[PDB]
Design a protein around this motif. Structure first.
Motif, PDB file in Angstrom:
ATOM      1  N   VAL A  67       0.825  -1.207   0.000  1.00  0.00           N
ATOM      2  CA  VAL A  67       0.000   0.000   0.000  1.00  0.00           C
ATOM      3  C   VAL A  67       0.863   1.261   0.000  1.00  0.00           C
ATOM      4  O   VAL A  67       2.001   1.244   0.473  1.00  0.00           O
ATOM      5  CB  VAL A  67      -0.965   0.038   1.220  1.00  0.00           C
ATOM      6  N   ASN A  69       2.643   4.579   1.025  1.00  0.00           N
ATOM      7  CA  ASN A  69       3.093   5.059   2.326  1.00  0.00           C
ATOM      8  C   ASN A  69       3.859   6.363   2.184  1.00  0.00           C
ATOM      9  O   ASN A  69       4.130   6.813   1.077  1.00  0.00           O
ATOM     10  CB  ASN A  69       3.940   4.000   3.040  1.00  0.00           C
ATOM     11  N   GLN A 172     -12.952   2.968   2.621  1.00  0.00           N
ATOM     12  CA  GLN A 172     -11.580   2.726   2.202  1.00  0.00           C
ATOM     13  C   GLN A 172     -10.667   2.504   3.409  1.00  0.00           C
ATOM     14  O   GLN A 172      -9.822   1.599   3.406  1.00  0.00           O
ATOM     15  CB  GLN A 172     -11.068   3.897   1.366  1.00  0.00           C
ATOM     16  N   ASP A 175     -11.417  -0.922   5.085  1.00  0.00           N
ATOM     17  CA  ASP A 175     -10.942  -2.056   4.309  1.00  0.00           C
ATOM     18  C   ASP A 175      -9.429  -2.189   4.366  1.00  0.00           C
ATOM     19  O   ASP A 175      -8.897  -3.293   4.532  1.00  0.00           O
ATOM     20  CB  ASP A 175     -11.394  -1.944   2.854  1.00  0.00           C
ATOM     21  N   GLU A 176      -8.731  -1.070   4.211  1.00  0.00           N
ATOM     22  CA  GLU A 176      -7.276  -1.113   4.215  1.00  0.00           C
ATOM     23  C   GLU A 176      -6.747  -1.480   5.604  1.00  0.00           C
ATOM     24  O   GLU A 176      -5.817  -2.275   5.721  1.00  0.00           O
ATOM     25  CB  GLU A 176      -6.679   0.215   3.752  1.00  0.00           C
ATOM     26  N   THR A 177      -7.342  -0.909   6.646  1.00  0.00           N
ATOM     27  CA  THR A 177      -6.945  -1.199   8.023  1.00  0.00           C
ATOM     28  C   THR A 177      -7.032  -2.700   8.301  1.00  0.00           C
ATOM     29  O   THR A 177      -6.086  -3.316   8.811  1.00  0.00           O
ATOM     30  CB  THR A 177      -7.820  -0.409   9.015  1.00  0.00           C
ATOM     31  N   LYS A 179      -7.196  -5.163   6.064  1.00  0.00           N
ATOM     32  CA  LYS A 179      -6.331  -5.919   5.165  1.00  0.00           C
ATOM     33  C   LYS A 179      -4.885  -5.934   5.638  1.00  0.00           C
ATOM     34  O   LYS A 179      -4.273  -7.000   5.727  1.00  0.00           O
ATOM     35  CB  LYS A 179      -6.404  -5.361   3.739  1.00  0.00           C
ATOM     36  N   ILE A 180      -4.319  -4.774   5.948  1.00  0.00           N
ATOM     37  CA  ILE A 180      -2.911  -4.761   6.301  1.00  0.00           C
ATOM     38  C   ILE A 180      -2.691  -5.301   7.712  1.00  0.00           C
ATOM     39  O   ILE A 180      -1.666  -5.942   7.971  1.00  0.00           O
ATOM     40  CB  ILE A 180      -2.268  -3.352   6.125  1.00  0.00           C
ATOM     41  N   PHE A 202      -3.465   7.614   8.828  1.00  0.00           N
ATOM     42  CA  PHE A 202      -3.488   7.828   7.394  1.00  0.00           C
ATOM     43  C   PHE A 202      -3.574   9.294   7.052  1.00  0.00           C
ATOM     44  O   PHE A 202      -4.181  10.081   7.780  1.00  0.00           O
ATOM     45  CB  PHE A 202      -4.695   7.135   6.763  1.00  0.00           C
ATOM     46  N   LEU A 212      -0.491   5.629   3.993  1.00  0.00           N
ATOM     47  CA  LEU A 212      -0.136   5.185   5.331  1.00  0.00           C
ATOM     48  C   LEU A 212       1.065   5.981   5.846  1.00  0.00           C
ATOM     49  O   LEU A 212       2.072   6.115   5.149  1.00  0.00           O
ATOM     50  CB  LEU A 212       0.163   3.690   5.295  1.00  0.00           C
TER      51      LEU A 212
END
Ligand SMILES: Nc1ncnc2c1ncn2[C@@H]1O[C@H](COP(=O)(O)OP(=O)(O)OP(=O)(O)O)[C@@H](O)[C@H]1O
Ligand SMILES: [Mg+2]
Length: 297
Positions: A67, A69, A172, A175-177, A179-180, A202, A212
């Motif tokens: 992702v 950063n 968003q 979902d990203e939180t 996932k990672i 973020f 990130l």
């Protein structure tokens, strides 16, 4: 090795144990220090190399994840002053989003307390019968907002995040939180360390991209536990900070934590043992040697 002095940069801000400097209009210097917090106090005694170890850890995870950063140069970028080499990063200046993006894989702290009071955490109504250090399947997005200086963040739900950043952006972030967190937690657990929970900060770049930033997956931004004797139902030891906590609340410190007054300095031996724990977490999870990380010891 010609490097600017820290005094060449404007001090922009920051919190308890990290510092932020302006390098130019679009870049910052993000500095980790050796200061350590325990029981919501910044302790008198720094942990030698803590800033370097936690910077190395963040850099590892930024490289692991795919992702976007905030890194804007190598760890030895010549814009980094010698006096913070190895514990400072050249980063892109972002517009930070006003939400703490916390992921919890296990129920503890304020998550557990909210559950015990209400049956829910951050808008997630959970199964009955959970308790201290219960695994959360699936892991939870448990957003929070910063409160007044010195006091704990406020847990909020998804609707609150929508009102803070927009509906599409909130989805968003969620979902990203998740996932990672899921990826990093599996990576750490494979090496025998549980990432119980973690907090992401973020920001948004000029192009509108979600980026990130701050620190990622460090013991300052996360709860790490040793998997080897993980035991649901009791409070797990802090992988990195338990020697500090035990000494402070033990018979030798002279300090009563309940007094809520500043704690005394740590034994040097406790500080050095804590340093070794940070190195152990870093090396076990990254598969790299801290001896190869840049900067003075
Ligand atoms: N790339 C970036 N661009 C702009 N601001 C950033 C970037 N990375 C971090 N920041 C911000 O800089 C500020 C200071 O960083 P620091 O990590 O000390 O804050 P913090 O995490 O709130 O500290 P603490 O957890 O000790 O309260 C934070 O508000 C953070 O959001
Ligand atoms: Mg800080």
């Amino acid at each position: 090795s010609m490097r600017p002095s820290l005094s060449d940069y404007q001090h922009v801000a920051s919190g308890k144990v990290r510092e932020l400097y302006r390098v130019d209009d679009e870049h910052l210097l993000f500095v980790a220090t050796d200061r350590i917090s325990a029981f919501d106090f910044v302790l008198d005694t720094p942990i030698p190399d803590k800033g370097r170890i936690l910077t190395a850890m963040s850099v590892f995870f930024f490289g692991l994840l795919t992702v976007p950063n905030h890194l804007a140069g190598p760890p030895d970028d010549p814009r980094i002053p010698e006096e913070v080499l190895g514990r400072a990063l050249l980063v892109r200046r972002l517009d930070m989003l006003p939400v703490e993006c916390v992921a919890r894989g296990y129920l503890t702290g304020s998550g557990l307390l909210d559950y015990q009071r209400t049956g829910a955490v951050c808008g997630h109504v959970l199964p009955q019968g959970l308790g201290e250090a219960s695994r959360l399947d699936p892991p939870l997005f448990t957003p929070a907002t910063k409160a007044d200086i010195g006091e704990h963040d406020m847990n909020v739900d998804f609707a609150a995040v929508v009102g803070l950043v927009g509906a599409v952006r909130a989805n968003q972030l969620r979902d990203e939180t998740i996932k990672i967190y899921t990826r990093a937690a599996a990576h750490a657990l494979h090496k025998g360390i549980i990432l119980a929970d973690t907090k992401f900060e973020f920001g948004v770049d000029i192009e509108g991209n979600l980026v990130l930033a701050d620190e990622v997956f460090t013991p300052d931004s996360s709860r790490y536990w040793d998997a080897a004797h993980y035991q649901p139902g009791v409070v797990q030891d802090s992988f990195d900070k338990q020697f500090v906590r035990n000494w402070l609340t033990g018979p030798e410190s002279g300090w009563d934590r309940a007094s809520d007054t500043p704690p005394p300095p740590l034994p040097d031996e406790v500080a050095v043992a804590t340093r070794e724990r940070y190195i152990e977490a870093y090396e076990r999870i990254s598969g790299l040697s801290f001896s190869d990380w840049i900067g003075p010891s």
